[PDB]
C-alpha cells in the first residue's frame, strides 16, 4: 500500500541496538501502525520486529 | 493464500511459554516459512512472533 | 549492588508497549548498563527484557 | 552457583535460529530454570534470552 519497505529490502536499525538484514514480514498495531519483521543477515533464522521509524533501507 | 490464520484471529500458544491475543502480522523465512505476529490481549502494544505450528485459534 | 529492583519485585512498563509481572533476571550491556528480565504475570513462561528506565515497581 | 556459563563467555545457539556473542546476564523461571542473556557480537546492543540447553560455549 503506502508501505515504506517491501519484502527483501535490506534495512538496518538507525540507532541504538543494532540490527541488519532483509524485510521478511510486517505487522500493524495501534502503537505501531507500520511495523516490519527483519531477518538478520548475520544470524540466519533470527527475526526481530520494529516500527518503520526505527529502520532505514541500505544497498 | 494458503494462510492458516488471518488478521484479527484470536490465537494462543499451544505449549510452553504462554501468549494470547490477536494476529497483527506475518513473516516468512526459510526456518519459519509461515509465521505470525500476535499482539497480547493482556499487554496492549506488546507483540511477539511465532511459527504457525506453535499457535492455535480460539474463540 | 546499587540494583534498583530485586528478584521477585512486581514491575510494569511505564509507557508504550505494556508488560507486567515479576523480575526474574538481569543483564548489562554498554547500551543498557542496568537491565531486567520480567516474566509476565498474564502469560506464564514468557519473559521480556528491558532497561531499568522503562520499568517501575508496583505492589 | 552451579551456573554453566559466566559473564563474558562467548556462546552460540546450537541449532535453529542463529545467535552468537557474549553472556551479559541471566534469568530463572519455572519453564527456564537456567537462562542466559546474550549480546550479539554482530549487532552491538541487541540482546536475546535463551535457555541453557539452547546454547554452547565457543572460543
Swiss-Prot record, chains A, B, C, D:
A biological process from GO: response to antibiotic
Signal found in the keyword field: no
Positions bound to NADP(+): 13-17, 47-50
EC number: 1.5.1.3
Signal peptide: none
One GO MF term attached to the UniProt entry: dihydrofolate reductase activity
Assembly notes: Homotetramer.
Further remark: Type II plasmid-specified enzyme is practically insensitive to trimethoprim and methotrexate.
UniProt-recorded name of the protein: Dihydrofolate reductase type 2
Native organism taxonomy: Bacteria, Pseudomonadati, Pseudomonadota, Gammaproteobacteria, Enterobacterales
Amino acid at each position: 500500500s503506502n508501505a515504506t519497505f517491501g519484502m527483501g529490502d535490506r534495512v538496518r536499525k538507525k540507532s541504538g541496538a543494532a540490527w541488519q538484514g532483509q524485510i521478511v514480514g510486517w505487522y500493524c498495531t495501534n502503537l505501531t501502525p507500520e511495523g516490519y519483521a527483519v531477518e538478520s543477515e548475520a544470524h540466519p533464522g533470527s527475526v526481530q520486529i520494529y516500527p518503520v521509524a526505527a529502520l532505514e533501507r541500505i544497498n
